[PDB]
Amino acid sequence: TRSSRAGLQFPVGRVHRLLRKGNYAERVGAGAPVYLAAVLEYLTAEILELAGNAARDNKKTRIIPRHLQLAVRNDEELNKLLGRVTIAQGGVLPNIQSVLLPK
Template identity: 85%
Template sequence: MTSMDPMAYVITDRGESGKVKGKSRSRSSRAGSKFPVGRIHRLLRQGNYAERIGAGAPVYLAAVIEYLTAEVLELAGNAARDSKKTRIIPRHCNWPSEMTKN
């Protein structure tokens, strides 16, 4: 192809392998997480926590945050149900910590 050929500048969605790429997936969906892995990675880089941040660190941190959130919500939901309420309010989040202080 010559430089004047209009087909020389056609942009395709093929990589170096020559195969057509599928629909792009977020790192959160690949990791199976509800929390944003990309945003956590950006915040880790901007926060001066380390000179370099590995690719697995934000995935692991997102999983830990998701697990802790699920635990707190489960305990708060149980506290709301015990008090015959259908909505969780901040007071329900305090009850489990008060119950475990025995």
């Protein structure tokens, strides 16, 4: 493969195909399917990280959409990135405005 040759889990082949076929440019370098597959791999790790955490925190062995949402909205940097994305079955973070609380 090449996932091997770059220590990646993410299909370095698949990616090189998709760049060429998805009409981004005439020609496509050798490093880029690797650079990108990596960045894709990197980021899917950070999510899987904090969601899993969240599934532990929420006492489950399996990650459901909520755990993703919690991971995402609680992370300041990830939340920005997915600033315009609604995640199916995410729900919302619990947040109740002060002045609404009892006295």
